[PDB]
């Protein structure tokens, strides 16, 4: 709370790609929608994506946004990115949610 501020909140089903099985799987193990933030650590000017399931508050994503990230807006309601360890996808609950999140992501990627 002291070092980070939320710069957006968006509704999405958070998924990760199981490359061994070539299938998307629910992040955290159970399907359903989460409230997904981008948090800005204002002191170090770093950003991370944190999402929590609406129903039971489980943290299902907590990943750094590195400078230079390629954010792929595959469709108007499904966006995705990768790191060295995982491929992440957000199935947004609406186009408005996708726009809110992408706008904050693109902002983070510009100021990083």
């Amino acid at each position: 709370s002291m070092s980070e501020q939320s710069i957006c909140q968006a509704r999405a089903a958070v998924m990760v790609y199981d490359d061994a099985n070539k299938k998307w799987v629910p992040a955290g193990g159970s399907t359903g929608f989460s409230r997904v933030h981008i948090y800005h650590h204002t002191g170090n000017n770093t950003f991370r994506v944190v999402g929590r399931k609406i129903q039971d508050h489980q943290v299902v994503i907590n990943c750094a946004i590195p400078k230079g990230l390629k954010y792929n807006q595959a469709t108007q309601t499904f966006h995705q990115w990768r790191d060295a360890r995982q491929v992440y996808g957000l199935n947004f609950g609406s186009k408005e949610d996708a726009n809110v999140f992408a706008s904050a992501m693109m902002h983070a990627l510009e100021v990083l």
């Binding site: 998924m15 998307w24 792929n72 595959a74 469709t75 499904f78």
Partner: peptide, 5 residues
Amino acid sequence: XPPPX
């Protein structure tokens, strides 16, 4: 990047 589910 992988295709959408």
